[PDB]
């Protein structure tokens with residue numbers, strides 16, 4: 001049965017981790033995956049996370065099955081993070097949330113749901129976007145079409161091209177939006193553009209599917225949900241796949257959520273039962289640990305406060321790193337002007353490097369970046385900044 | 397988009413948990429899901445598990461991504477549990493293991509793998525079997541056909557009917573076998589029958605897919621893998637989906653594994669890369685916690701020893717419970733003879749009750765069993781045994 005199976009090609013992002021580790025050479029620098037790093041080059045477990053974990057160790061009485069949709073308080077907390085406390089979506093019971101194995105798993109169950117209980121056949125993903133978007137959707141049978149987004153020359157959001165591209169999307173089609181910290185460009189629509197996209201969307205009959213994997217990394221928790229909340233004010237139906245991998249440093253525990261919104265409770269209940277049916281044929285119920293950590297930290301005044309501070313420290317460190325990056329590049333001798341890096345949000349920056357340039361950096365300097373020229377700014381430290389910038393300049 | 401979505405029907409097994417909890421009445425007894433219970437009616441976290449968890453709390457330095465296939469030592473330990481330490485499958489590097497979100501998730505990734513990189517179109521599942529088997533396979537596009545198994549009259553393995561049913565399966569078809577503790581019958585093939593099934597299988601060109609969710613609950617760890625090991629001695633290719641939910645009481649942490657076996661390392665490597673591609677489009681990488689617990693307990697002499705004893709205590713308690721069950725039924729006034737219950741293995745017993753009988757038990761006595769008449773023996777305690785047996789007799 002397996003004699004003819006052809007070797008699958010490596011993930012441009014994940015296949016990078018293998019090379020990096022298999023690669024010897026001490027000075028090797030890893031700017032691939034979007035994993036946070038502190039000033040020392042380590043990606044530690046948050047203190048608030050350690051505290052919640054000890055709490056669980058002493059207060060956990062059983063490991064009994066968690067229920068299809070996971071932990072309730074977990075679901076309640078995510079909806080408030082996403083829509084705000086007052087929110088009518090919460091008051092009218094228009095939304096239902098399922099705990100999932102990461103944001104990747106939230107996207108898959110969303111795909112599985114749509115492809116089986118809906119008439120959707122195509123999903124629109126920005127160009128560029130997280131490579132794995134296509135794969136998740138293709139696996140569910142949906143077709144992936146792309147819309148324009150990045151103005152490479154000026155390094156901005158090419159809104160006209162965006163509108164014009166989406167003009168080809170029909171009613172009943174799914175359009176995927178990154179809530180904030182666009183991967184891999186770092187450029188996001190303003191609130192005006194978000195409202196404009198909301199207006200257009202309700203007229204074209206599109207189903208918005210928001211991917212929120214970096215809430216809190218652009219401006220702040222609440223501010224980062226401004227786009228999403230603008231859509232939710234006008235849409236009767238929307239799906240949101242969110243993650244707690246970055247803002248909670250819970251990468252390997254697979255904590256995410258798929259939030260379903262319908263016109264009213266009765267409908268969302270019906271729609272949700274089918275979603276739970278999609279989870280049951282996939283993994284049964286979700287992993288409790290990482291989610292129990294999130295719910296306990298969020299349900300507790302002191303723990304949440306500590307967490308919120310750790311989060312703003314991560315955001316601020318990245319912000320210092322990109323500024324230092326731009327300056328050291330100039331200081332080091334780079335001809336091109338990289339000031340636009342300072343304008344991007346999140347952990348990355350679209351360096352604007354060519355494929356051969358990223359190939360030489362790795363091969364010749366042990367510096368690891370994604371082929372698209374995406375570099376993880378949160379992986380830059382005051383100590384690796386210099387050899388990194390020298391590598392880059394000698395490749396420009 | 398969601399206005400026409402029809403409400404999905406409840407899982408015969410999982411939908412039971414809802415009813416049970418939504419049902420008031422103190423004396424209500426739950427014999428539904430296959431979750432272990434101790435003499436007090438609680439399903440506690442194992443001591444060995446608590447010890448490994450404390451170890452992690454103090455020794456864990458990061459929550460950084462785990463890699464597509466999960467923890468290596470985890471994979472190494474499961475292969476030894478499944479095939480034995482000496483095993484040539486291990487020595488020849490013929491097997492590869494991926495850590496997954498439970499045994500359910502191992503079945504799905506197996507399905508996703510086969511349906512996309514193989515020419516399989518149909519999977520054979522015993523009648524009866526775990527209801528969710530059909531759903532997982534149907535979700536991947538494969539077709540589910542059934543083979544005979546249980547001789548309801550004599551309460552035995554109808555091997556002739558089994559052979560005769562499978563005679564309709566073509567070469568290149570997948571046949572699913574329960575490694576031990578057949579769900580829901582509790583009847584398993586002898587080693588002779590296992591070898592016979594192995595012989596037949598290699599001649600008909602079937603791809604064996606073993607579902608191991610109860611290793612250690614029939615006779616013992618090693619003995620329970622006798623069937624599987626007989627197949628592995630003769631087959632060049634096989635897939636095994638195993639779980640650590642019951643034998644480790646890690647239900648809600650989703651710990652399982654999908655083991656791929658091919659003729660040689662080069663082939664399995666090629667086949668495995670595609671499997672990893674199937675995991676990437678589903679959930680990325682697996683949840684670390686429950687798996688780190690399993691690897692730490694298994695890699696440690698003292699912890700493993702404690703775990704092995706906790707496991708044999710669970711097995712033995714169940715064995716005392718079914719014996720008490722049969723006796724109290726006779727003592728209480730049941731006309732029928734239920735001695736065959738004593739012959740079954742695992743947590744359950746196919747009571748042989750009718751749908752209307754299980755309906756009346758619940759509705760009238762608050763006793764919860766699966767419609768098929770499957771009752772969780774590991775949920776019976778010396779204290780609930782009497783009202784339970786009285787409920788049953790007044791329904792016969």
Ligand SMILES: CCCC[C@H](NCc1c(COP(=O)(O)O)cnc(C)c1O)C(=O)O
Nearest residue numbers: 013033034102103104130183213243245680
């Ligand atoms: C999972 C490995 C990729 C990490 C990272 N992208 C992770 C990621 C996800 C989902 O990740 P989690 O499942 O871990 O929640 C969703 N959406 C975006 C836009 C992401 O960048 C990157 O390299 O950009």
Ligand SMILES: CCCC[C@H](NCc1c(COP(=O)(O)O)cnc(C)c1O)C(=O)O
Nearest residue numbers: 284409429430498499500526579609639641
């Ligand atoms: C998951 C809820 C069902 C529990 C139980 N069947 C669980 C179960 C599984 C997979 O379960 P995990 O994913 O939790 O590893 C695989 N195979 C069998 C034969 C099972 O009975 C039952 O009610 O029989």
